[PDB]
Design a protein around this ligand. Structure first.
Ligand code: K
Ligand code: K
Lengths: 256, 256, 256, 256
């Protein structure tokens, strides 16, 4: 397959949108849902098959030889390259990990395996790499946009994990978590497993976002020991991320 | 009209002062007032007619040709240029948007339309551009002053919007907002729609200012779900603004 | 007088120490004391006479001509230069402003005049200028040390002013201030005008210091409307100061 | 002894691991333990004897001559160099400072002397110096990693000291400390000297880490006057450390 082909470019954009959706949904899937509900069933399936098509197409596309800028259309070379680079993980990731979880005795570890899907963000990474290679956009502006996307995605994933760490404790001993002890205004999170999904997600995202900016107000904070450790890890990584963002912005203004 | 004319320069300064007042007052107009009170009536009218005169004058003045530095005084060219660039928005914004709101059944969308008047900040933007063009002031210092003004104005507008988001909820369900749940010292905001305008404005501005500096104390925070989303958007934009300011300062120090 | 004379250098160091003490004490004098207590009386007088001697000596020393590097010892030139630049304010600030306050009906404005002494920091400013001129120390390191001293001194002055703003309210209506509403641990600041000076000073300095670093915990915050305005001004100035410090550090690492 | 000898390199790595352990444990030993519990007895002795062996070996190895790059193996020179630079305090710190404390009337000052052992971090310092000398790693990346390690270690030591400052007060007057007044969720630190070591350490580390990132939430803050002073010193030093880290990152991005 000719790499720049008009149809292949459209397929790349389509799979990029699907990858963005899957990367944004999988942490939500794992954290806010101890097993998918019925309505999204078919949705999950089509996503899988969509990525399946991508696999059955990834065996066909020719690859640029990095050391020597020469295209290769031999099927053996491309097959072997896919085999070593990005085959086993995509295959193990597009398995149906929800029906497996429900059927196989509801063992959590098999869902813990649901995080295996996150390397679909490699599609967005390659998107940003191509955008950097393009001359219409400045290199450092592309780098900063990539960093902003990375910060937003890490904040979203951290919010999902932070909510998940509240469901680890038994439901009876729930007042000892970050959520369930909140009393914002007149609303008290008495039973936080019966509230609407969007309310809990927005609360967790609000906490994660105000922690990343470094405002830290203090209305939502850590109570458990696991939540404390997660908060320390998150802020330690966030500080370096923010320093890097400031560094690239300063670099463009100084040199660009 | 000769572009550099002494009288036209005085008119430009007068319109700049009026535009600064209008830009600082329109968010206050929209947020803190569900309809103007009677006292400022004539004041509002005066501003409108002033800008009307500006529009009448904006047609007469000749324009500089950017691609080829030749000044052209033909009325048709300046008329067409003003028609294309900055005519429709200025006129639609110079309509009386207060008496219309009161007469036409007190509908909210027409008052939402009052935000059109913020395009008068283009006058301050052009003023800073002229200051940058002037050789008496360093370019990066001008950029940093512009950035500081942008940060202050965005903080003021964010404070106005944050107070407005508290009035969206019905008056009976008011303890579920950022204001109305405050208990700073001995003063509790029991009925926050009966307090003086300056107290509410100062409280909102205090919250917005301590959120922008990133102190985030935590005496004033978000409670509603709409307030949470607004806070996330505010801090996400403010982080980039502050990083840009730090980059500009470091740029002048390193290079200048 | 020969500018580099060994005795004059010792006198300069002596007056530098006295100026540092006076600059650190005058905000404390104004804020924490509605009139000096008896014990420090003679101390105050001593400082005055010391600075008196300084100005008496300052009329004698020769001055360097910046435009043309030619030293002048003609007393008329140095006398006129001192009359022009730095005479009137030192004289008016070296008046006894405590006995004047106590004798003249305890009027508050004459005590507000006590802030004139803050221009003794010009001694430290010139000290840092000389240190920058010296080749033993790197220029940007000297600039950063000066910036850190400025930040610390501004924090100390802001703490003094913040405590003073709590004493403007009447003693009966004291629970509406930043102090007097504190309940840190088991200690409640019931009557904050009868507590030891060091406790109140340390509380105010703790608030100011954690506001400057941008931690902002939220145990000590603003309640009054005047305190809110002071906090906004302080954080707005502190943000620029911190950005400048980051810029200078980055400059030395990048270029030095 | 030949400096680059592989057995000596293995010994250096072994002593480096022991030094990392000792540096991470000594603040914990001093703060969280008023005398070691019996179980770690032999462990302590082992560390001591290990460092003893290091001292015994440190005499044998030849030293690089900095001014003139000639290797000298004469035992008198390496001896005198060790006697001058880094022995007296290595030995004084290699003394058994726990059994001394228990036997000699449980006097606190000899335990304060336990802080001498922190200069085993010179091993990690020389670790990073050699890594900087190595050409496989960029110099500024090595500096950034060293700064990150310094920040983490200073945070750990500050957490240990902050917990120690809570034990200085008598156990009866314990509610006036940073710990013992905590009411995180349903858990109240009623008697904080009976809780598990890991819970107290994690709480102190959580406070120190969120103070360093500058989030400052406000659930754990200072109450005592000693804690206030320690917090001011910590944040004043941490601000400079963070500015230095941002400067190094920006320099690497701009120049490298
Ligand atoms: K806070
Ligand atoms: K903060």
């Amino acid at each position: 397959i000719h790499p720049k082909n008009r149809w292949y470019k459209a397929w790349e954009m389509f799979i990029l949108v699907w990858a963005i959706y899957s990367s944004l949904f999988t942490p939500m899937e794992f954290g806010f849902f101890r097993g998918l509900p019925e309505r999204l069933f078919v949705l999950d399936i089509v996503g899988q098959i969509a990525f399946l098509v991508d696999i059955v197409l990834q065996f066909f596309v020719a690859y640029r030889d990095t050391q020597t800028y020469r295209t290769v259309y031999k099927p053996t070379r491309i097959a072997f390259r896919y085999l070593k680079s990005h085959f086993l993980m995509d295959f193990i990731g597009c398995f149906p990990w929800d029906l497996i979880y429900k059927a196989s005795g509801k063992h959590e570890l098999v869902r813990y395996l649901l995080w295996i899907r996150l390397f679909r963000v490699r599609k967005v990474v390659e998107f940003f790499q191509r955008l950097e290679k393009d001359t219409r956009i400045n290199y450092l502006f592309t780098r900063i946009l990539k960093l902003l996307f990375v910060e937003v995605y890490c904040t979203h994933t951290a919010a999902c994990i932070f909510y998940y760490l509240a469901t680890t404790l038994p439901p009876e001993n729930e007042g000892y978590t970050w959520i369930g002890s909140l009393k914002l205004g007149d609303y008290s999170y008495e039973n936080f497993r019966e509230i609407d999904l969007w309310k809990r997600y927005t609360t967790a995202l609000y906490f994660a976002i105000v922690t990343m900016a470094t405002v830290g107000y203090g209305d939502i904070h850590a109570v458990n020991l696991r939540e404390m450790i997660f908060v320390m890890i998150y802020v330690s990584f966030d500080m370096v991320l923010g320093a890097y963002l400031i560094g690239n912005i300063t670099a463009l203004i100084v040199k660009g």
